[model samples]
Target: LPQNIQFSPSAKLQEVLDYLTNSASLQMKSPAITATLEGKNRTLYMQSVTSIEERTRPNLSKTLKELGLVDGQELAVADVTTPQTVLFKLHF
Candidate 1:
């Protein structure tokens, strides 16, 4: 099971802005994606990027297609960037 996260408007919007700015790192990815905003510039330092295997990847394409993004668009997808976090519970 995954824990539900509740964020106030400020917090949620801040995370999105952080993602765009790329100030979010792996550690911060654990909480909200943290980004620093200067007068007119932003930077991104990440620890990881999210992905899926062949089995699940097609589902992603399907969803994107449903949403109108062309399927199988060969874009430069890589892990050179970082800071990817997923929400889920771990049981020992």
Candidate 2:
């Protein structure tokens, strides 16, 4: 499960992605985890995840959509079962 993450006021999405990248890096025990943060600036509320697949990507995407921060169709998503890889390409 992902620990509850809260961004301070005026935090960017990159921070969250960076946090996840670090988490995944540690979880996977390597720096090969791949993730990207792209798009216009958007603020987010607190977020949580239970396992990478269960809630991480899904919740993040839902938050972005709910906040009207990005277009769902333009959002690029990919995940690899092996090595536990995840990639999120959000459109501005």
Candidate 3:
């Protein structure tokens, strides 16, 4: 990915998510974000404090280094907090 960001390994995953969400103009209180990280050697689920009971996923509470996030890893984020709904007829 061209947008390479440097984060302090000591920083929490929530900080990373915040940067991403804010950069995307998603608003400060944007819904919980979950993502899959694509690394050259392996793929991992990016887990936030609000997510993941499965051991395979990395916890957001941990620092980046603790999560084994090495160089050149790409993360694909998804918003799971919002429910989808569609409206048809316009009501005045």
Q: How many backbone collisions does model 1 have?
A: 6
User: What is candidate 1's lDDT per residue for 1-92, written digit by digit as tens?
Assistant: 23333323223233432443464332232222222233222212223334323233333223322322222222121232333333322111
Cα lDDT tens digits, model 2, 1-92, are 22234444344544544554466443222122222236452223223333433433443444333444432222222223224433333433
Let me know the TM-score candidate 3 reaches against the reference structure: 0.47
Q: TM-score for every candidate vs. truth?
A: 0.19, 0.28, 0.47
Q: Global lDDT for candidate 1? A: 0.28
Give the better candidate number (2 or 3) by lDDT: 3
lDDT of each: 0.28, 0.36, 0.46
The better candidate by TM-score, 1 or 2, is: 2
* Deviation (Å) of 36 in candidate 3: 6.9
Supply the global lDDT for candidate 2. 0.36
Candidate 3: residue 26 Cα off by (Å): 5.8
lDDT tens digits by residue: candidate 3, 1-92: 23456776677666666675576544323333332335233323334442443553355466766665655544444454324311111111
